[model samples]
Target chain A: DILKANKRLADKNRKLLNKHGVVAFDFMGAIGSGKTLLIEKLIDNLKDKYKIACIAGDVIAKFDAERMEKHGAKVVPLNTGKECHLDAHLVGHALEDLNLDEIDLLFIENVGNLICPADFDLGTHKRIVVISTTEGDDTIEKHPGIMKTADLIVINKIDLADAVGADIKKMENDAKRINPDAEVVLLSLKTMEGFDKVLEFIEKSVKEV
Target chain B: KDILKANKRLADKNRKLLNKHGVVAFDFMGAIGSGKTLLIEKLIDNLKDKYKIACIAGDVIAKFDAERMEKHGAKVVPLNTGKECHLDAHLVGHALEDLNLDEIDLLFIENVGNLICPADFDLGTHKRIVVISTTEGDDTIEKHPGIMKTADLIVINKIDLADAVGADIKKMENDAKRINPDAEVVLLSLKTMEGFDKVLEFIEKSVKEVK
Candidate 1:
């Protein structure tokens, strides 16, 4: 019955994906990557026009899901219990409970990890890798494949750009070198500088979807 | 859609398989240079006859680790998680097939050498051993809270290399005690075979509980 359910679920997803032009974008990164702040901004600004759903994965807490839900987004809390990753199979189950007819964007916030989550795909339309200035410049170069797989690169926490001694130019150069194909968008949620690019990117993405 | 649903189905199957066999697995976890591989190798060399053993060797992109245990009477099933930093229950299910659980007294799965990932994933293991080597740094316990919190036993390896690396073993043991008041941290030098019997004694006592 689970297999049959999965098959039908996949079939329905394909039909809805085509019918509604739904684009599932994954938000992934190591802990303290400012994914929450970025996600909140996206939901807060975009929800008036487009319907959004989220699956927040964690090893322990569901605090992230609660926050997303507060912003009027449909949230599914995936407590991996002890699992390090949020695989595509699990995302399929989360999507099962969603009303795809009303959905325009689906965001899957992976477990707060850089390597393990990158290895597992959760059926998202595009992979957007997030990295914060606090994590250091070496952080981007450390995980080659994670950046390599991203369709978009977000260098977050630029407000702390001076305090942390973060070289924004170096961060951009690093990501640019890793993912030449991906569009690099650098922004600071705290100060709101360069925040417009995230909106611009999402608007273009929704149109492309 | 297929990938999303496929994950949960696999997770359920792996959990059920562990329960079916009455197998209690232990995840031997550590960082890149930690002595997890050597500790298991020593156990195989010393206890192959008295205890029937099964092993799964997890690596980032290599299987040489599995082959390294051939002499220790361990049927090493290599779980190569292409780009993953850790092993999951599904991979554990496949590795366990090399040996009959009914015939073995203890089974060990050497998780990929990373403190971050192995700490979160439970592969239905009865216990977890988080190995910390003296060379890695004395502050390793505090740097990795997840592994320290979940570890049943902490094996502090490479005692001989401590002085050379300017690492203090006493500081590491103190760090372990601070993280978990109840954890047992044993010191061992796999190269020198120093304090190895203590680990054997600990294993003997732990395995008896399952039996």
Candidate 2:
């Protein structure tokens, strides 16, 4: 019953965003998986091309919001406190705080968690799950629930693979196995390697929507 | 409410049982790749000669962590939580029954690799140890204050890579102190074994209190 109610609200949120011509994306991943950095980078590169806004979610602090704000995007910090994920209801409230008319693209950064965020639908145009090689190569296999919900899986920290002993191939193969339809991109945000692909993918999604 | 109440009841029973055997146990909680397993293995290597050690490794599906700890010569119980996000007292109660409690002087219960869900489940341990690595970023403590409050000892691992990853270790330490003032914070690297003796000292000290 609860999830059904969430589904209805998510659909409503989707229609509302679509009506305003705002294409939104949800970024979900574990703590320190480079979700915040990825979002900040995206905003920095695309700020001129598109009007961008972000909803930064965390359990308590507004630290992520502050980081994203430095890149000149309008940011609303959603602190979940004890809650692990952002549900459609929370996003709906956050959506009202932003002036959606001025935004061509929105990025909703879910709380740094790999598990509970998968269960909640935030009614975004697409879901991008970020995982770093430092989190281990088996991360994709262990979190299949989230992987199944992803439209794009970003395997970050490829540059640290040798130092961390993470099997990049295994992670990539596992992501493909869990979600064959989802695009998998391996990039090192630190090195700015493979970032162009991510930018291109986002631009294409915004255009299609 | 009913599930948690049931878990609490079972958890009390587990504590009583563990206490009867004079075994001091700790529950390890953190995100994936936070170095829970490696820390336990190193602890086993250091303490096995003095105190008999056993581990209960919890995972969503794989026994990879359990298998790794077993190599270090500790009796281990591999727990598969299936779709469950955290290990509840009921599952750990069953795990305790399988272990030879009389032979184990110390027990390490590794919760599923999660920071959020495990904060709610009590595994009937003498202390709860939460691990976070520099690789996970600097804001982890500030974001997950609820879990930070649940910790008796908070470990910041991989300090060796602090600068490489741009992690502010002092900020993390200060945040932990602010959130859980009583919780002891230890900064160490599993890679280099720096600041590891403090962890052993904390465990040995806690064991003394319980015994």
Candidate 3:
């Protein structure tokens, strides 16, 4: 929606099914943003109650998928074969063999690229943008398009406050300035410290849906 | 190149679709241990019942991520670039058929576990997310152009390990902002979900609303 001026970007994928009000979302960021760890927690926390699956996209390795499997959810590891990001069709095919009726939530872990993934569509309802505390607080205006397109923004890894020297309050303010409307979540998978707020938000999101 | 011609054809077809859904697909691009997979897993765990999901798994040489997502419950398509750098939309087109896009709500595409190449191509996705870790050197951004200016969302992963690495978080943020003036920078630790609520809010506003 932020790229409203780019007509070429307006070309949408119309083959999706939204009967259950089910939506697919993509997690994007630079390398080392904790995309897998957060998902692992979700799988561990929700596997028993929710029907969740993940399509993990990467450029060369299948290591991320291995972690998701331990959570007991359907996991698919996609190799981009040197390409940058994944498109709608690729995501569409991932579900061809699975029955969506049985699954309640599906997550697509796009390739580890910051640029190409922005231009594609993978049949998801929302875009979850994740950033880590160790990465810094100056990311607000660095990639406005992605932030403009994000439905949610996550700030992972807040436990290590001393070593990284990141000002948590300043980081939060910076995020708010860029996308004042975005709901920002903060926590760490290593310590399992700030996940309660995130869980609460997710519960609310589901209810709204 | 067949890819060029194929892309042209695909692009044309995409342009011709009668009903264009205003949805965007993005990825969790980064290096190993960047935490791309787990982030998506959390989204599925919390919102699965509300969303119809699908994905394109991009990996370096194995279907390791594909296997994991299958277990997580995603209707997934595995694309092994095989020693390649990243993923383009053409391969994505090859992965799907008979899917009614309008009927579905969201799609997640996982790119190869790389920091470059993937940024150069426009794979018909909506956004590109760059996930970097504290363990790696901050100077990497200056080293790679495709990694710098290309990121829309720069993710700082593994905050838990940042202190051990003695990372300069402020400098990293400054570096990324200097490169991509239009990016939305976020700080987080998946292990702790330090900044996850904000992530969820962004998702709801970005893809759910027709703004």
Candidate 4:
């Protein structure tokens, strides 16, 4: 019943975003999975062409919002206190603080949790889950609930694959097995490898919308 | 209310059972990739000849960690939480039934790879250790204060990569002390074995006190 209630609020959020012609994405990942850095990179690359804004969710600190602010994007830091994830109700309130008309794209970063965020819907157009090679090869298999919910799965930190003894192929196979519909991209934010594919996907999706 | 109250009652029973058999238990809690399993494996490698060790590895799915620990000559019981984010006392109690407590001198319970949810659940262990790595960021301790407050020992693992990741070990140590002044914080690297002696000493001290 709580999920149904969340769904209703999420629908309202989607309608509101649609009315403003603002495309929003919900980025979900674990702590140190590079969710903030990935979003910052995107903002940096796209700010010249589009008006960008971000809603950074964290359990206590607003450090992520400060990072995004440096990239010249309007940022709202949503602190969940003890809560593990950002629900549609919280994101709805964050939306009210933004001028949706002036924003062409919005990024809602969920809390740094892999489990709880899978249950909540924030009414974003796409859901991206970032997992790092340092987390281990079995991460995708162990967290199927979150993987199944992602529109895209970002396998980050390929630079550390050998150092961490993580098998990248196994991670990709696991992702494809759990969610065949999800587009999987392997990249290392440090070296900027495979980042163009992510950019391309976002651009194509934005154009379609 | 019902869940926590029931969990507390069951946890007490587990603690009594472990005490009756003179077994000392430690619950390891942390995020994924924080070196919980690696640390446990190292401990097992170092202690298996001197002490009869057993481990309970909890994960959402897959028995990868359990298998790794098993290879280190410890009796490992894999507890899959499925959709549950953290391992509760009830699950630990069930897992205990599968373990021969009389044969175990030291029991290590590896909680599911989650910091937030496991902070609220006690798995009937003598001590709780929270592990965080530099890769997770120096701000990780401040961000998850609830978990930090519950830890009896806080370990900042992967110190070798701190500079590469731009994480300040001093800041992390300061944050740990600020959040849990009573808890002992150790900067460790499972690879280089730096600060690992302190970890082993802490465990041995706790085990002697309980046993």
Looking at chain B only, the TM-scores across the models are: 0.87, 0.98, 0.84, 0.98
The CA lDDT of each predicted structure is: 0.73, 0.89, 0.65, 0.91
Model 1 over residues B116-158: C-alpha lDDT tens digits?
A: 7676577757678888776444655665667888888888886
Tens digit of lDDT per residue, candidate 4, span A1-209? 88999999999999999999999999999888999999999999999999999999988647999999999999989988867889999999999999999999999889888887999999899999999988889889889999999999999989878877899999999999999999999999989998999898788878988
Candidate 4 per-residue C-alpha lDDT over B72-139 given as tens digits, one digit per residue, 9 for 90 to 100: 99998899777778898898999999999898999999998887888988888989999999888788
Instruction: Identify the superior model by TM-score, candidate 1 or candidate 3.
Output: 1
Best by TM-score: 4
Residue B92 of model 1, lDDT score: 75
Candidate 4 — which pairs collide? none
TM-score of the first chain alone, every candidate: 0.89, 0.98, 0.86, 0.98
A186-207 per-residue lDDT for model 2 (tens digits): 9999999989989988999998
* Clash pairs detected, candidate 1: A82-B120, A88-A122, A88-B3, A88-B4, A89-B3, A89-B4, A89-B5, A89-B6, A89-B7, A92-B4
- Which has the higher TM-score value, candidate number 2 or candidate number 3? 2
Given candidate 3, what's the lDDT at residue B11? 40
Alpha-carbon DockQ of candidate 2: 0.61
Residue A154 Cα positional deviation in candidate 2, in Å, after optimal superposition: 1.0
Off by more than 4 A, model 1: A1-16, B1-82, B86-116, B120-148, B151-211
